[PDB]
Amino acid sequence: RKQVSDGVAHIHASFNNTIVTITDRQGNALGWATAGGSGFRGSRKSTPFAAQVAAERCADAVKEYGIKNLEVMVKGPGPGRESTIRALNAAGFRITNITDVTPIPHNGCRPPKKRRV
Amino acid sequence: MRHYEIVFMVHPDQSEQVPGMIERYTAAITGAEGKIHRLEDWGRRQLAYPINKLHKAHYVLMNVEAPQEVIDELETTFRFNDAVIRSMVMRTKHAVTEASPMVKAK
Amino acid sequence: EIDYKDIATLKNYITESGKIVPSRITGTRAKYQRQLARAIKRARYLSLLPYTDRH
Amino acid sequence: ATVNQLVRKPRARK
Amino acid sequence: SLSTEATAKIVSEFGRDANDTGSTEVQVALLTAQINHLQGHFAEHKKDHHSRRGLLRMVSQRRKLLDYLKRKDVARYTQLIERLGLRR
RNA sequence: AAGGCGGCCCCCUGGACGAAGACUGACGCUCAGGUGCGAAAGCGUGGGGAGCAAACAGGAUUAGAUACCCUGGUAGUCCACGCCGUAAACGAUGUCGACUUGGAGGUUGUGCCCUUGAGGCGUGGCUUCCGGAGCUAACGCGUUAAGUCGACCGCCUGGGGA
Ligand SMILES: [Mg+2]
Ligand SMILES: [Mg+2]
Ligand SMILES: [Mg+2]
Ligand SMILES: [Mg+2]
Ligand SMILES: [Mg+2]
Ligand SMILES: [Mg+2]
Ligand SMILES: [Mg+2]
Ligand SMILES: [Mg+2]
Ligand SMILES: [Mg+2]
Ligand SMILES: [Mg+2]
Structure with missing residues (x-):
C-alpha cells in the first residue's frame, strides 16, 4: 500500500523483555512485537529463543512496504543480542547496518540502590 | 599584560557580515594599547555534531594581546549578538604568531 | 607545546566512538596525557571531534 | 612521659 | 604577590640600595601591601575559607617580624609603624 | 592542614616545589586557655524540585512483614542566609629536626653528554610495593620507622557501671 524500501530496526534488550520494532529512517513506525505476547511469560519471557520469534513475527508485518535494506539498532544490555539479528536474516532480508545505540548517561542522575539477595 | 586566544x-x-565584525572590534582594542597577532578567516567548515539545528559553521580564529578592559565588554557583546553562536576565550603562555594547521593545509 | 588545533594528532589518540585512549595502550608520557585530555575537551566544545558514535 | 608535663600536674595517685 | 613594578619599587623605597631586599623591614612592607591588597577581596569572598588561611599566615608572619625589630632596635621600629600605619 | 576536591572557559586568590645567585642575621621549634576551619544527617527563614528517597500508601513474601522484594511517594538531597561542630573525621600512628645497607616503580623538575631517538650520565621534591641490620607481644614496621635520639604538647591506669 506504500513503498519506503529503507528499514530501521530499533530493537530493545532488557533483562525481562526484548522488543523488536521496525521503523523507517524518518521516525514513522511500521510495526512492533514483544516477547510477552509471543507465548513467553515471566521466566520464559527472559529467554533468548523468545527474541528469535519476536524478530520474525515483527518482520512478517512489515513486508507490506517492500523493505530489502534495513538498519539494526541494538539498544540495551539485555540478553538475546545475537538471537534477534540472525532471525532477521531468517526472514529473507539483506542486513546492511548494525549499530549499538545503548543510552549511556554521563553520570546525569543518581542510580537506584543495590538489590542484595 | 595577558595573552588571549579568542575563538x-x-x-x-550571516557569513558576509564577518569582515565588519573584524575591524569594528579591532579599533576598540588597538586604541587602548592592545596588540594583535593572528587574524585568520576560514570560511565554512563541517561540524563534528550539529549545533542550534545548523551545519557548515563559519570559523574565525584570533589572538589578542590586550589588558582586562576588552575582556569585560567583548564577551558580553558576543552574548548580546545573535550572530555569534559560540564564543570561547583562553589564556595562553606567550605572545605567539604562528599559522594554524587549518591554514597550512587549506 | 601540545595544542588542540592539529586534529590529525587527536585522531590518533581517540577511538571510533570518540573515547579517549589512555596512556596504557599508546604508551605516551603522563605529562602529555593530562594535557591531551584537556586539549580534546577544548576541541569537544568547538565541534571538532564527536562525543559518541551515536551522533 | 615528659618531665616538663609533670611540672604542670603530677601523676594522679588512685 | 604583586607584579615586578610593585615588588621592586618598595624594596627601593625602604632599602638602602637595590640589593637590600632580604632585610626584615622590607619583609614587613611585602606583607603590609599584600594585606592591604586583600582588603576588598575577602569582604566579597567571605566563603573562601581556604584563601583566608593564606591571609592568616601573612598576618602571623608580619607579627613575628615586628617582634624582632622591637626587641633589638626600637628606633627603626618607631619609624616603620607610622610610615605604614600600624599599631591601630 | 584536614574533612575533602573532577565538564570546559574567564576573572580574583592561596600554598607547594626546582635552578642560579644576591641579601637579613637565630628572626627558631613547640603549644594549656583562646581563635578559625571542619563528611553527612538534622534545625531556622525564604526560594527550588528531575531523579533518588526516612515516615507513609499499596501489592507479594510470611506464623506475623513492621524489614527484605516490587509499584509509587513527602521531608531531605539543590541555592542563598545562619546555627548545629559530632564520625570507623583511620595511616586506627601529634608536630619538628639530626643520623643509619639497599631494590622494583610511579609522579615532578633540573645539570652535563658522539642532541648521534621521546635516549646516556647525574641530581632534588613527592609517592606505593618488597626487603637487610635493628625493633616488636605477635602481626608487621624497616631512610616517608613502629630503628637508634633530642625539643615540646595531648592522653590512658581492670571489665561493666559510663
Ligand atoms: Mg603564585
Ligand atoms: Mg652580613
Ligand atoms: Mg525542621
Ligand atoms: Mg522499600
Ligand atoms: Mg532545610
Ligand atoms: Mg569522638
Ligand atoms: Mg591499615
Ligand atoms: Mg631480614
Ligand atoms: Mg618493609
Ligand atoms: Mg574506671
Whole structure:
C-alpha cells in the first residue's frame, strides 16, 4: 500500500523483555512485537529463543512496504543480542547496518540502590 | 599584560557580515594599547555534531594581546549578538604568531 | 607545546566512538596525557571531534 | 612521659 | 604577590640600595601591601575559607617580624609603624 | 592542614616545589586557655524540585512483614542566609629536626653528554610495593620507622557501671 524500501530496526534488550520494532529512517513506525505476547511469560519471557520469534513475527508485518535494506539498532544490555539479528536474516532480508545505540548517561542522575539477595 | 586566544564562530546565514565584525572590534582594542597577532578567516567548515539545528559553521580564529578592559565588554557583546553562536576565550603562555594547521593545509 | 588545533594528532589518540585512549595502550608520557585530555575537551566544545558514535 | 608535663600536674595517685 | 613594578619599587623605597631586599623591614612592607591588597577581596569572598588561611599566615608572619625589630632596635621600629600605619 | 576536591572557559586568590645567585642575621621549634576551619544527617527563614528517597500508601513474601522484594511517594538531597561542630573525621600512628645497607616503580623538575631517538650520565621534591641490620607481644614496621635520639604538647591506669 506504500513503498519506503529503507528499514530501521530499533530493537530493545532488557533483562525481562526484548522488543523488536521496525521503523523507517524518518521516525514513522511500521510495526512492533514483544516477547510477552509471543507465548513467553515471566521466566520464559527472559529467554533468548523468545527474541528469535519476536524478530520474525515483527518482520512478517512489515513486508507490506517492500523493505530489502534495513538498519539494526541494538539498544540495551539485555540478553538475546545475537538471537534477534540472525532471525532477521531468517526472514529473507539483506542486513546492511548494525549499530549499538545503548543510552549511556554521563553520570546525569543518581542510580537506584543495590538489590542484595 | 595577558595573552588571549579568542575563538568565535559565526552563524552561516550571516557569513558576509564577518569582515565588519573584524575591524569594528579591532579599533576598540588597538586604541587602548592592545596588540594583535593572528587574524585568520576560514570560511565554512563541517561540524563534528550539529549545533542550534545548523551545519557548515563559519570559523574565525584570533589572538589578542590586550589588558582586562576588552575582556569585560567583548564577551558580553558576543552574548548580546545573535550572530555569534559560540564564543570561547583562553589564556595562553606567550605572545605567539604562528599559522594554524587549518591554514597550512587549506 | 601540545595544542588542540592539529586534529590529525587527536585522531590518533581517540577511538571510533570518540573515547579517549589512555596512556596504557599508546604508551605516551603522563605529562602529555593530562594535557591531551584537556586539549580534546577544548576541541569537544568547538565541534571538532564527536562525543559518541551515536551522533 | 615528659618531665616538663609533670611540672604542670603530677601523676594522679588512685 | 604583586607584579615586578610593585615588588621592586618598595624594596627601593625602604632599602638602602637595590640589593637590600632580604632585610626584615622590607619583609614587613611585602606583607603590609599584600594585606592591604586583600582588603576588598575577602569582604566579597567571605566563603573562601581556604584563601583566608593564606591571609592568616601573612598576618602571623608580619607579627613575628615586628617582634624582632622591637626587641633589638626600637628606633627603626618607631619609624616603620607610622610610615605604614600600624599599631591601630 | 584536614574533612575533602573532577565538564570546559574567564576573572580574583592561596600554598607547594626546582635552578642560579644576591641579601637579613637565630628572626627558631613547640603549644594549656583562646581563635578559625571542619563528611553527612538534622534545625531556622525564604526560594527550588528531575531523579533518588526516612515516615507513609499499596501489592507479594510470611506464623506475623513492621524489614527484605516490587509499584509509587513527602521531608531531605539543590541555592542563598545562619546555627548545629559530632564520625570507623583511620595511616586506627601529634608536630619538628639530626643520623643509619639497599631494590622494583610511579609522579615532578633540573645539570652535563658522539642532541648521534621521546635516549646516556647525574641530581632534588613527592609517592606505593618488597626487603637487610635493628625493633616488636605477635602481626608487621624497616631512610616517608613502629630503628637508634633530642625539643615540646595531648592522653590512658581492670571489665561493666559510663
Ligand atoms: Mg603564585
Ligand atoms: Mg652580613
Ligand atoms: Mg525542621
Ligand atoms: Mg522499600
Ligand atoms: Mg532545610
Ligand atoms: Mg569522638
Ligand atoms: Mg591499615
Ligand atoms: Mg631480614
Ligand atoms: Mg618493609
Ligand atoms: Mg574506671
